[PDB]
């Protein structure tokens, strides 16, 4: 067995930069294989000097791709990097086929940003050989998605996703049908347990995977439509299972299967995807296939919201409600959500006076899905539930704040609200509900005075879409109110993060002295 010496690595690098040969490449790659397999397993090479090992890693990842390219220079064709036909290419292709899973092991063992960047770059200069394989291209896109899924550093996730875009947009044929599958499967099974720490990271994962679906208008439609259907299967399995008498699997508590964060993560990611693809600018006066999936997504979400009208899962309703509001904002589709909200306004929490008041911490409505059975029937929980509910009404009826149809979108709601306000016992709730009522009437009066000067009827869609294009949405009475409220909410979340961040900083201080 040859022993790695600082001389031998130096000579291999010496002749790498000038006149390399396939023998040298196989030797380097075999040494690399030993280097990466030292902890995890005959081998011709032995490694004893950290200097030699580090030099081997350096020269391999930074220059073996360079020599590989120089031997078999690829040519750009229709924006894609494609190898030519020839014997020498095939010999080099087997060599990259003998380097690929060492890169895979490095990918699976990423722990920091710069190592991720180096491995991803070296992998980048070896796509055109590994596109010819599917045990490697799949595991490649499966591994980097694994890194994109499990890293706790936002920079590492950014690097992984930038790699996914750069490689995917070049080729689009072998990878794109696997990138989307792997990413959304991450959102199914290998989903990150939610917490105030992981929210920006998972939000980036969703806001990122949304872009990938939008790149290919047709193929995305092929993928998401299948996966959303998978959700529907679970949705249909739990509804039937709860309703029927069969003691097969958990008739009484089947909610566990579908009332999970992973499922809500799914339905949020789909709303983000459709919103991204359906934006008016990306539409550009051109219909996109993803718009036709709006109806399935809305049906699934509405079917999930109504499956339990219990206080234990009101936070779950709120999140999907915000998602639907986003979808309607971006696409302009008319989602009915007030019937749901008013239907919850008959509950024992929105209606009956609080029983206990232990003075626990305020519930994290944004970043939780469940009440945890201690906040049930408490002053804090009622006060926070209503705090969310009022702002949700504000958002939903701020969508149409400047439309001509707002008066008649408001009338049935103000009447029902006054019915509930006049019959509701809880003082604080009546105060909050009241505020929304008068501001709704105020914006109704505003739109009426602005509409009295209109000469075109309801049929003229072109002019109807032009109504008050000069006026900003936030200048309306419901906008000017709710926008400010949004700030009064947004700042709060900031002060949470700018607080929690410090806690960890303080925590770090302790291990300094431990």
């Amino acid at each position: 067995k040859i022993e790695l010496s600082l001389k031998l690595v130096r000579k291999w690098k010496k002749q790498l930069h000038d006149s390399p040969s396939l023998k040298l490449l196989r030797n380097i790659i075999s040494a690399f294989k030993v280097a990466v397999n030292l902890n995890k397993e005959d081998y011709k090479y032995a490694i004893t000097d950290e200097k030699a090992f580090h030099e081997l890693m350096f020269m391999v990842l930074k220059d073996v791709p360079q020599a590989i390219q120089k031997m078999a220079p690829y040519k750009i064709v229709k924006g894609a990097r494609t190898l030519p036909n020839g014997g020498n290419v095939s010999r080099v292709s087997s060599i990259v086929k003998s380097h690929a899973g060492s890169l895979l092991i490095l990918l699976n063992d990423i722990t920091n940003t710069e190592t991720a960047a180096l491995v991803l770059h070296s992998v980048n200069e070896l796509m055109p050989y590994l596109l010819s394989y599917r045990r490697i291209l799949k595991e490649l896109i499966k591994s980097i998605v694994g890194v994109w899924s499990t890293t706790r550093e936002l920079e590492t996730q950014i690097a992984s996703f930038a790699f996914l875009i750069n490689t995917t947009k070049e080729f689009k044929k072998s990878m794109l049908e696997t990138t989307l599958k792997t990413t959304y499967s991450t959102f199914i099974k290998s989903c990150r347990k939610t917490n105030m720490r992981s929210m920006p990271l998972i939000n980036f994962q969703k806001n990122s995977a949304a872009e990938l679906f939008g790149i290919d208008e047709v193929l995305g439609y092929q993928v998401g439509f299948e996966y959303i259907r998978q959700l529907a299967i679970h949705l249909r399995n739990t509804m039937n299972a709860t309703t029927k008498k069969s003691s097969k699997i958990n008739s009484a508590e089947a909610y566990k299967i579908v009332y999970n964060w992973q499922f809500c993560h799914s339905l949020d990611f789909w709303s983000r995807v459709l919103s991204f693809a359906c934006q008016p600018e990306k539409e550009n006066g051109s219909e996109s296939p993803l718009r036709q999936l709006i109806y399935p997504l809305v049906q699934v979400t509405l079917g999930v919201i109504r499956l339990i009208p219990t206080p234990q899962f009101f936070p779950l309703r709120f999140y999907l409600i915000k998602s639907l509001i986003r979808l309607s904002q971006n696409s302009g589709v008319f989602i009915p959500i007030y019937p749901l909200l008013s239907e919850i306004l008959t509950s024992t929490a929105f209606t009956k006076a609080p029983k206990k008041s232990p003075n626990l911490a305020a519930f994290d409505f944004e970043h939780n899905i469940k009440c945890t059975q201690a906040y049930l029937n408490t002053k804090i929980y009622q006060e926070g539930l209503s705090e969310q509910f009022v702002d949700l009404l504000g958002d939903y009826f701020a969508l149409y704040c400047k439309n001509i149809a707002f008066p008649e979108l408001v009338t049935p709601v103000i009447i029902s609200l006054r019915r509930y306000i006049k019959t509701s016992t809880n003082v604080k709730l009546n105060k909050r509900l009241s505020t929304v009522v008068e501001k709704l009437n105020q914006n109704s009066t505003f739109i009426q005075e602005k509409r009295s000067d209109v000469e075109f009827g309801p049929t003229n869609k072109s002019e109807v879409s032009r109504f008050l294009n000069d006026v900003a949405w936030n200048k309306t009475p419901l906008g000017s109110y709710v926008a400010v409220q949004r700030e009064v909410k947004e700042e709060k979340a900031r002060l949470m993060r700018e607080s929690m961040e410090e806690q960890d900083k303080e925590r770090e201080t302790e291990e300094a002295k431990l």
């Binding site: 902890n39 995890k40 063992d109 722990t111 706790r152 099974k189 290998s190 990150r192 347990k193």
Partner: protein, 78 residues
């Protein structure tokens, strides 16, 4: 009906299908007791460990080259 005749062979007893005996681990110091016995033993992080400690244990285990029986537990589900 259970009885001694059903007893498993000693050489194969207390062995997972991966071939590694499971050893409970609480902290990094207990992990380091399995430094070389990577072939014979695989670590298993205890149920009561917090998420912040589990990532450190996983990193140290990868550095040592010791197989963890239950990774992605409380960092992922199932």
């Amino acid at each position: 009906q259970p009885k001694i005749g059903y007893g498993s062979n000693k050489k194969t007893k207390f062995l997972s299908p991966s071939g590694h005996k499971t050893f409970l681990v609480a902290n990094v110091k207990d992990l380091e007791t399995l430094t070389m016995h990577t072939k014979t033993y695989a670590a298993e992080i205890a149920h009561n460990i917090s998420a912040k400690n589990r990532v450190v244990i996983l990193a140290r285990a990868k550095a040592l080259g010791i197989k963890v029986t239950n990774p992605k537990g409380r960092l992922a589900l199932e």
